[PDB]
């Protein structure tokens, strides 16, 4: 069925990057809150690299 998961922002922990990334519902459910997160872990292929500029907020 529909899981009604909200999208979250997550921050890249590459000290050179530190950009905020807006995750899909699916990625937002999967995020391990107890572990580091980095841009390459984003399945959003538009924002999945530290070289890619941060989406507007």
């Amino acid at each position: 069925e529909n899981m009604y998961v909200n999208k979250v922002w997550v921050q890249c922990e590459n000290e050179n990057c530190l950009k905020w990334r807006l995750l899909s519902s699916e990625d937002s459910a999967k995020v391990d809150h107890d572990e580091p997160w980095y841009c390459f872990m984003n399945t959003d292929s538009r924002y999945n690299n530290c070289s890619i500029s941060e989406e507007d907020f």
């Binding site: 909200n6 979250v8 922002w9 997550v10 921050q11 905020w20 995020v31 809150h33 572990e35 580091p36």
Partner: peptide
């Protein structure tokens, strides 16, 4: 992971 709800 550091996160913010939308």
């Amino acid at each position: 992971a550091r996160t913010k709800q939308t």
